[PDB]
Design a binder for this molecule. Structure first.
Ligand SMILES: *[C@@H](O)[C@H](C[C@@H]1CCNC1=O)NC(=O)[C@H](CC1CCCCC1)NS(=O)(=O)CCCOc1ccc(OC)cc1
Length: 174
């Protein structure tokens, strides 16, 4: 019994000051502000072998080398389906897997603190998701927002922000 399968969890990878997500053997997505700056390589590969595209808080890497050939390609949607329940696949650095149910709101332009093209959502984990047990916390950014379309899991955003209440979260979308 699980919520998300082991292979889906294995796509969530530590990166910079947060996480990213292997969409495919070659495509990696993350949140812009956790990405290392001023570096010459990512995952050992020189920049010249990585197509890099950062738009707002959404960063995509496409590697020339097949970096995760164990994986199949999954669909990256252009945003999450508004009004539907997704799961945020939080890994914590102490080892926990913390999938957080979230009902997704509207895609909107936002400026938290930078220009965010993001989508808000409401966590469905408790009355007020403050703290580590029921919500998102510093270090969680880059975690994928996923949902299942039919029998297949889809990814639609990466974790970017949350209010101090914790109940509202924001993912960056493509
Ligand atoms: C990940 O690095 C971290 C996650 C966040 C911290 C606290 N709980 C979380 O889930 N994200 C941040 O710290 C985030 C970073 C900015 C950097 C520039 C681009 C946007 C993200 N800052 S913050 O502390 O999360 C912002 C707090 C308020 O955020 C919101 C969210 C929704 C909203 O709806 C109206 C208003 C403000």
């Amino acid at each position: 019994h699980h919520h998300a399968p082991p292979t889906l969890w294995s796509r969530v990878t530590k990166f910079g000051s947060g996480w990213g997500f292997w969409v495919s053997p070659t495509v990696f997505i993350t949140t812009t502000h956790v990405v290392p700056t001023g570096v010459k390589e990512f995952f050992g590969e020189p920049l010249s072998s990585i197509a890099i595209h950062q738009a707002g808080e959404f960063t995509q890497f496409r590697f020339s080398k097949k970096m995760r050939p164990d994986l199949t390609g999954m669909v990256l949607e252009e945003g999450c389906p508004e009004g539907t329940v997704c799961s945020v696949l939080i890994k914590r650095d102490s080892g926990e897997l913390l999938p957080l149910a979230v009902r997704m709101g509207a895609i909107a332009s936002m400026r938290i603190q930078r220009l965010v093209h993001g989508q808000s959502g409401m966590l469905l984990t408790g009355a007020n998701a403050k703290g580590m047990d029921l919500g998102t916390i510093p270090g969680d950014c880059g975690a994928p927002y996923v949902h299942k379309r039919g029998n297949d899991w889809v990814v639609c955003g990466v974790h970017a922000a949350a209010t101090k209440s914790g109940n509202t979260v924001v993912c960056a979308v493509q």
